[PDB]
Amino acid sequence: GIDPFTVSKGEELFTGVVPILVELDGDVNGHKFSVSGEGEGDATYGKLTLKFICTTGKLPVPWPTLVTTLVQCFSRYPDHMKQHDFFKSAMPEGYVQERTIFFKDDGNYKTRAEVKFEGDTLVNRIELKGIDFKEDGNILGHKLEYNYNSHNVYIMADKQKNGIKVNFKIRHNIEDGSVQLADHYQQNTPIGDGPVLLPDNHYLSYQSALSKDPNEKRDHMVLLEFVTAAGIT
Numbered sequence: 001g002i003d004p005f006t007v008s009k010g011e012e013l014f015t016g017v018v019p020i021l022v023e024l025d026g027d028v029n030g031h032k033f034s035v036s037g038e039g040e041g042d043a044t045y046g047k048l049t050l051k052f053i054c055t056t057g058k059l060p061v062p063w064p065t066l067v068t069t070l071v072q073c074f075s076r077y078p079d080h081m082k083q084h085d086f087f088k089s090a091m092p093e094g095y096v097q098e099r100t101i102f103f104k105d106d107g108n109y110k111t112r113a114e115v116k117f118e119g120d121t122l123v124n125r126i127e128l129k130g131i132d133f134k135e136d137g138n139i140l141g142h143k144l145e146y147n148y149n150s151h152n153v154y155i156m157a158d159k160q161k162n163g164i165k166v167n168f169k170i171r172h173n174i175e176d177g178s179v180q181l182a183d184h185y186q187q188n189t190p191i192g193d194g195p196v197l198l199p200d201n202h203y204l205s206y207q208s209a210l211s212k213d214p215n216e217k218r219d220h221m222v223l224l225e226f227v228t229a230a231g232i233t
């Protein structure tokens, strides 16, 4: 376990503005790519501000399809729900997030992310594997609009893994006015062996805004996100 003179642990680590670093290696139908991200999280306000860069050249999938993969420890938990915040409770040692994302009538992503502090910086290191995609489909054919809807993310305890299980549905707008559904199944497990907060059923309410940096010539995404826990009282 951690040093019992650790200065900041659990939710204490999130009372201020925290630098964030994200690193992702991906392979979707053999199209390999990497993404790096930097920004800040201010959990008191549920606020994330990040800029992501495809470091290998052109991103072979639409940026919106990576939003859910690219640090739920920055969610704003109401005071009356603080005992349900698994994500912060696992820090600084961190947690592993695993997902399968089923794109309706297309392929799936499977992801594994390790989220932990490296000093003052909250780091998310991710591997993403996509298979079974249609080369001329909405994903590999880049037919998804550069925008994002608000969603609820449903969280319950997984006592067997000393963690949580999560599911939700993302609707990505297609350029023809239709919808590309992405069904997310998720589990998180702590990296350390200490106590964590196993929550009652609740959800996170997400808002996401995607933009471009007018001075950035690399393939990139600027993301502004607000996340608030809810559904208890």
Ligand code: NA
Binding pocket: 200
């Ligand atoms: Na309860």
